[PDB]
């Protein structure tokens, strides 16, 4: 009676870990994708900023 009752609790915990791993694993993959995406975004943003400075400097030199 009590033995079976506590056996069910142990089986449920094992399933949770497995499911938790899966969900956690997925989050890790997603995090890496977002990380590289942000890097490229910054790169493009910084690339344009360099072009802008050139233009700004040209105007100043002309002035």
């Amino acid at each position: 009676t009590e033995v079976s009752e506590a056996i069910y609790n142990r089986m449920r915990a094992e399933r949770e870990a497995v499911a938790r791993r899966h969900r956690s694993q997925g989050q890790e993959e997603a995090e890496k994708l977002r990380a590289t995406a942000d890097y490229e975004v910054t790169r493009t943003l910084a690339e344009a900023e360099r072009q802008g400075r050139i233009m700004r400097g040209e105007g100043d030199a002309e002035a």
């Binding site: 915990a13 791993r21 942000d38 890097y39 910054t42 790169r43 400075r53």
Partner: protein, 109 residues
């Protein structure tokens, strides 16, 4: 005394479950860490690229500006100077008290 008997059997089972919780924690916090690592690493890559690109742009501005200064140094110096000074003087609370004036108080809030 029968009540205590089943409690002890439940204790053994309770030991095994706590382990699973700790195990799950390890199998859940460790992947998280791996994700947090690729984030900071990607950020560093951006930093390197960012400073490099920013440096290039600034360099270019300096290069162009340089010959202009070499032509009329005094005129360029005066203009740039006044322009910079004007900005700071107009963003601060100036006093302009004569040299005579001595002791003061900062009054830092």
């Amino acid at each position: 005394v029968k009540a205590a008997f089943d409690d002890a059997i439940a204790a053994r089972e309770n030991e095994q479950q706590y382990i699973r919780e700790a195990e799950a924690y390890t199998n859940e916090v460790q992947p998280r860490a791996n994700g947090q690592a690729q984030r900071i690493l990607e950020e560093a890559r951006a930093y390197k690229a960012q400073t490099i690109l920013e440096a290039q742009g600034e360099v270019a501005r300096f290069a162009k500006l340089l010959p202009e200064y070499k032509a009329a140094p005094e005129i360029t110096r005066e203009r740039l100077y006044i322009e910079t000074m004007e900005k700071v003087l107009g963003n601060t609370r100036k006093v302009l008290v004569n040299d005579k004036g001595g002791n003061l108080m900062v009054l830092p809030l």
